[PDB]
Structure 1
Amino acid sequence: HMYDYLFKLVLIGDSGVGKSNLLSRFTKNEFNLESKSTIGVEFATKTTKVEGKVVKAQIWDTAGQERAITSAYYRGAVGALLIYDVTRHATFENAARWLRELRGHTDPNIVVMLIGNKCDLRHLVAVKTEEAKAFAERESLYFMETSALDATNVENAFTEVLTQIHKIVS
């Protein structure tokens, strides 16, 4: 293989938090203004040079609501983005219930990052950054605020994960 490492990452979080757009903004630098709820499981790939070595991230992406294929979706996942909508406090509370789901199906030592998405909708921010920092520290998660719409921190969040995974694995 051309790459040194192949890291399977999963995106989870409630419907409409922007998971699919985060991905397409990372892989294909596009903001899908015309997005729609995801059917089944979609995939995407990116090959990066962190460390001076070749990393092929393999990103799985599924919808938020109504399963049983939870099974294959999480299996072998080695990093995860836990994404909530910065303007809808309901999506941020459900993060712990996603975190239990994610944890019942992965190794305790995967790299997990909490993402607060849509940080551009600044006048509707309904979740205090400090409260999300609280949940992140309480649960040993990484933490970022992102905007898929204006690319803010999207690259930083994904690479950060991928670097943190390699340090475990070397």
Structure 2
Amino acid sequence: GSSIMKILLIGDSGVGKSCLLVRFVEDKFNPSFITTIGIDFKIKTVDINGKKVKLQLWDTAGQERFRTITTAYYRGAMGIILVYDVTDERTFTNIKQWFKTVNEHANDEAQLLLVGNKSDMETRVVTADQGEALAKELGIPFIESSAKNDDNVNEIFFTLAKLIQEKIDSN
């Protein structure tokens, strides 16, 4: 019932883009269509620094079909999270690409964010420094976490929130 903020998750499959949301939002009743529709939308009122802001987040299976629409999500994103798994290397690679894909449609006044996930298992074929490299090459912040500790998960989002909120105060 206040200030809105559109957020979306970009990345490949396996990355755990889903689980991160399930975990980010505390709801057992809310259903999951991402298995069937290939899309799933979720609101979550969050705050920091006395700000009643509601987060809207899209999670897509990318899959062809409604791509015509999932595409309309970049056009609206107020912030977007580029995500990758650190136990898979081919996961890391594509990030420059998705990033390109984001500059195309994402009204680049969008708050991007590198996100190294699944740092649970320690098949960690990538390191924190590696990711902070691309992030610095891209000119966007970075973080990590693992929905197996509920650690940094909330940070992941609270971060984007401020970055977005402030980029709104310079105005």
TM-score, normalised on structure 2?
0.87
SS at match of 1:68: helix
2:129 is aligned with 1:154: no
CA-atom RMSD, angstroms?
Answer: 1.7
Q: 1:152 Cα deviation (Å)?
A: 1.9
The number of residues matched between the two structures is 162
2:85 is aligned with 1:90: no
- Show the counterpart of 2:31: none
- Contact 1:79 1:112 (C-alpha < 8 Å) held by counterparts: yes
Question: What residue ranges of structure 1 are gaps of 5+ in the alignment?
Answer: 31-35
- Contact 2:42 2:58 (C-alpha < 8 Å) held by counterparts: yes
- Show the counterpart of 1:105: 105
Question: What residue ranges of structure 2 are gaps of 5+ in the alignment?
Answer: 29-33
1:120-159 paired onto structure 2 within 5 Å:
120-122=120-122, 124-159=123-158
- Contact 1:38 1:62 (C-alpha < 8 Å) held by counterparts: no
Q: 1:13 Cα deviation (Å)?
A: 0.5
1:60-99 paired onto structure 2 within 5 Å:
60-66=58-64, 67-99=67-99
- Contact 2:38 2:63 (C-alpha < 8 Å) held by counterparts: no
Q: 1:157 Cα deviation (Å)?
A: 1.0
- Show the counterpart of 1:6: 4
TM-score, normalised on structure 1?
0.88
Q: Where has structure 1 moved over 3 Å in runs of 4 or more?
A: 36-39
SS at match of 1:73: helix
- Contact 1:38 1:63 (C-alpha < 8 Å) held by counterparts: no
- Show the counterpart of 2:51: 53
- Show the counterpart of 2:22: 24
- Contact 1:14 1:65 (C-alpha < 8 Å) held by counterparts: no
Q: Could you tell me how far apart the structure 1 residues matched to 2:161 and 2:143 are? A: 14
Q: 1:106 Cα deviation (Å)?
A: 1.5
